[PDB]
Design a protein around this ligand. Sequence first.
Ligand SMILES: O=S1(=O)N=C(Nc2ccccc2N2CCCC2)c2c(F)cccc21
Lengths: 300, 255
Amino acid sequence: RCRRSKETEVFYELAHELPLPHSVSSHLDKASIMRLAISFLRTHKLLSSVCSMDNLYLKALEGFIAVVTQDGDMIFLSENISKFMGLTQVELTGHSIFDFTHPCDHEEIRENLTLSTERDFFMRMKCTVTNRGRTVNLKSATWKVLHCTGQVRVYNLSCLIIMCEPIQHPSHMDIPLDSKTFLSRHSMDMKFTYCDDRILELIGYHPEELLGRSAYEFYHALDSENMTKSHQNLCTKGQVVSGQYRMLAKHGGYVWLETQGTVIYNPRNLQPQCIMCVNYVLSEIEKNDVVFSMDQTESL
Amino acid sequence: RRRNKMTAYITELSDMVPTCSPDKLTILRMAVSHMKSLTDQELKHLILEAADGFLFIVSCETGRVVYVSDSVTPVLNQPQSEWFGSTLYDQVHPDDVDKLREQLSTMGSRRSFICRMRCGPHFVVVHCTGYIKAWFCLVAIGRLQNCTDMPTEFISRHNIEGIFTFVDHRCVATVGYQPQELLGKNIVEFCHPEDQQLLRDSFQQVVKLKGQVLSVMFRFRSKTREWLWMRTSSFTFQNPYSDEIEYIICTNTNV
Ligand SMILES: O=S1(=O)N=C(Nc2ccccc2N2CCCC2)c2c(F)cccc21
């Protein structure tokens, strides 16, 4: 009978000995304590395999770190995951990635957990935080797109160590934007419907003349494999970050761009309205003496 | 269901902690004792493994770094001394200094920007996330994440007629033409008449066979007015959303 009070006190001691804040550790479930201890020391095994000031690294991150296993077990998630996903570190650590991600991406996730070792993909994970900071419950969770970049490791058996960054919504941005970044609006086929005035001083295009033009005619063809995929991802997940591609400049040459496309929706009919692209110009005009398309040749 | 998973969790913790690797309640006190025999420094290694990034704290005004993690050497092949004691304006592409001033301008506000940093002249694209912490400083992790035209072939884009709507620079080495000379003109204009029909047939097929790659050869008229034999492998590109035929993507290869 007294063993129960001894069992509760040793469970309490185990929760406290986990590297966690004393509150959430003290008030926890027994099976959750088991999960967290197992995951923590299994992650320690992986970390000893790898290695053979926390607030600085954690807050200077537009994403959270997640190591998942080959079976899909999220053996570790960085503490700041909540900040992006609403679900706290305790709620997800030890559970399957498939139980908290979009099923339509599971195979992709399944394809990335297996086995080169570099991985770079997009996945829709459950989220319960809103643009106001108000965290909601799992019954009303929304799908958040995460760009996951990382490596798969054979720790002695596999582990996907990835950094998952959200793609900020263009309407809700708390990060500053430089004069080397401009906005654009597109229909769902990536045809231009609007773009910023900065494109004039950045790429030479008059913002009005680009309207109605297919963006597929304005990037250097050597990047098509990326662009297509991005668009496809943008159409299947609602969000995507392109790779670093070349947009043909006005009077010849190209500029280097990385853009984050997000499908937006009219809130009165909830249908896909358009795609908002925040385009980071990564360079000046390169090879401006070499025209590539007719849009540059007609422009004298 | 609860009992089986609880027993499996206790067994996992036993299979995990090797110092009793078999009683029950004592496993928990053992696990606490093996946990007390040990999580901060390894987060940097996790960042370097997944994102291939390094931390740096830089003075907001002068740009002089006030701290740089050792991971700068794995990321940019640059010694820690090369970074410590200098400004980020010196460790970045010149055409990238202006943006830097806008990012370092001034507050726990965040910061997110891309810039070309020098590595151990070779520049590499680095994505920097971070935030402004007064010490005013910016504490930020920066991480690492074809150009063939700038030669046996060159790729081009055409409308359905064949009008060059895009050509990469390799053309100037293969057919000898400047891109302006090919752009705006149909590909048949550069074909030996004896082959023109055949070429046109292919352009009617790649559209009629959407997404399939056809290949036809013909005698391209070069800038030197030679009849250079050439194998064009072309296909129709489709807009992934509306399936809208966008252009015919040809790969003209000297043969
Ligand atoms: O160079 S562009 O004309 N091509 C663009 N995008 C584009 C074209 C074709 C396929 C996919 C894309 N995407 C890039 C990531 C999101 C979707 C684009 C842009 F999104 C903004 C400004 C200028 C240009």
